[PDB]
Amino acid sequence: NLPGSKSVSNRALLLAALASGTTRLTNLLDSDDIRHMLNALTKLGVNYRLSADKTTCEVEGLGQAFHTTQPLELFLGNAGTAMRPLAAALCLGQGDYVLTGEPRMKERPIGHLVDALRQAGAQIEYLEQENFPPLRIQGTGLQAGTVTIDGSISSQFLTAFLMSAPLAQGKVTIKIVGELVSKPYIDITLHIMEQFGVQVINHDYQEFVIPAGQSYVSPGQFLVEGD
């Protein structure tokens, strides 16, 4: 048996948290980076039941974006695979967050994702160095409309944006400039979103359209693929 992909484990934990219903994730990776994501979810008010072997986690979904009141620091050690999807998702609801981690987290570049979120109206501030964590993020919701993303962008940034786009105020259209790289990785993300009940119209990787009014819905069990 092969363990779950770290990035798939954290992305599926975040969708399970946003989704209606409880999702039993299986083959979850037993890793501290998954624990940093669980800890963020706990601080954000999400309940879950984690099995003794740490590879099974039932996440009780909020059925909508996070809404916290007290300003919160979310310290994520060196978990890039938790920082990136959260930088986007934290813009969707209500709250005031500092997204940060250990000194090495501050060396993880994040500017291309911040730029995409800001095209959709996000309120994000760099607290130390431009283009890097720590970030101060305000929950504002994301605006409907067209955003333009470069085809050479690292897939993890495009993925983080796509995962949050269904919870924007209306239809989101992502235009890609040039030839999109890492198409198979984008495919994995689109597949996970589909399992959580969301449709993304893919125009041969030149444009992605996320119709308005969708919600993530628990598929019951989500099996985390290897890699």
Interface contacts to Cl ion, rule CB under 5 A: 7, 80-81, 84, 155-156, 159, 185
- The DSSP result for 149-211, as a single string, is EETTS-HHHHHHHHHHGGGSSS-EEEEEESPPS-HHHHHHHHHHHHHTT---EESTTSEEEE-
Binding site annotation covers 11? Answer: yes
* CA separation for the pair 55, 50 (Å, rounded): 8
Q: Tell me, what amino acid is at 113?
A: L
Binding site annotation covers 108? Answer: yes
Residue 5 CB, nearest approach to Cl ion (Å) = 10
Angle at which helices 6-18 and 80-89 cross, to 10°:
30
**Nearest residue (beta carbon) to Cl ion:** 80
Binding site annotation covers 155? Answer: yes
For residue 70, how many C-alpha atoms fall within 13 Å in the half-sphere facing its CB?
6
Nearer to Cl ion, 71 or 111 (CB): 111
The DSSP H or E segment spanning 119 is helix 111-119
Binding site annotation covers 195? Answer: no
Residue 30 CB, nearest approach to Cl ion (Å) = 17
Residue 204 CB, nearest approach to Cl ion (Å) = 19
Nearer to Cl ion, 85 or 95 (CB): 85
Under a CB-based contact definition with an 8 Å cutoff, are residues 25 and 55 in contact?
no
Residue 109 CB, nearest approach to Cl ion (Å) = 11
Nearer to Cl ion, 6 or 220 (CB): 6
Q: List the binding residues for 3-phosphoshikimate.
A: 6-7, 11, 154-155, 182
Binding-site annotation, residues:
6-7, 11, 80, 108, 154-156, 182
